[PDB]
Amino acid sequence: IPNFEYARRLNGKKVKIFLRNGEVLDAEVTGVSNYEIMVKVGDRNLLVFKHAIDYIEY
Amino acid sequence: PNFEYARRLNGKKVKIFLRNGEVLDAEVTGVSNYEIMVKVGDRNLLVFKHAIDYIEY
Amino acid sequence: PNFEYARRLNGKKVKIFLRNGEVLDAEVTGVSNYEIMVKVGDRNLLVFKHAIDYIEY
Amino acid sequence: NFEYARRLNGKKVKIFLRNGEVLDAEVTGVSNYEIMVKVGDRNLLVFKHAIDYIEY
Amino acid sequence: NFEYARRLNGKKVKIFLRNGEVLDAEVTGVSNYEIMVKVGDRNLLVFKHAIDYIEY
Amino acid sequence: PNFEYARRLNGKKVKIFLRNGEVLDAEVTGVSNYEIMVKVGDRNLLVFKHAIDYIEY
């Protein structure tokens, strides 16, 4: 199926995002596109590039 | 054509060697074009293929 | 498809966290498929998206 | 879809990974993004993106 | 095929590579994935994926 | 359009500067979308473009 992806299923959910730089984000996913993921981390809004993510725990 | 070996890993116990040195002793629960779902102990993980060097199966 | 969240940043003051540890306090002046144009102080930079970890906005 | 990597199928090669490791390997399969190898007793799926170069 | 990098085709720019190296360069060519530069007396094909950003 | 300067390097002696810090004193024997084939001394290398930073030619 063209464009199928598991990351969409994380919308709305609270997850831990492990970045390639060692950072870990305690985040709530507010949006997912092909190449990006939108999250709230505390007071912060972040646009995270999927290419920068190693894995996500959910 | 547009074939990929990673799909055959669905259902299998593998060791995943990440680009940062970590190794996951995991069971593959799903595979898409860019991601691999695994259970590691009690932990549910979505792992991006770009962060994987190689997989031992 | 033809959607990206980065286009929403055009014209905004943001913090760009590069993959090299640098953090650019930037004004976004353009967004293309693979690049973001920013003014950092007096400098004009063309920043490749692949070099960006995330952006605070 | 032309690629040289396909021609390595069946060959003994040295795979230089992006972290510094090297693999003495027998190529058993090649897809668009992956190379399947046997390294001694081990079966590996190697992503091309993690490889720097290959000596054949 | 909209990209800003094409607009640099004749300009002197500073290219900041992913490994920390900096190039004082005059752009001579730009393709989808490459930028051709003269740095001093050297002729370089620089891959865009190796570039973090460019000051122009 | 599908244009890439690397095709011109076919046949030439060049210095390849890899993302890892290595330099290859190489003769280009073939070029595809994703790969460059080189002879470095008596050695035959398949070099992935993604692992190349730049090339002096």
Curated annotation (Swiss-Prot), chains D, E:
GO biological process: regulation of DNA-templated transcription
GO-annotated molecular function: RNA binding
The Sm domain, residue ranges: 1-56
Name the UniProt record assigns to this protein: Uncharacterized protein MJ1435
Portion of the parent chain present: 16 to 71 of 71
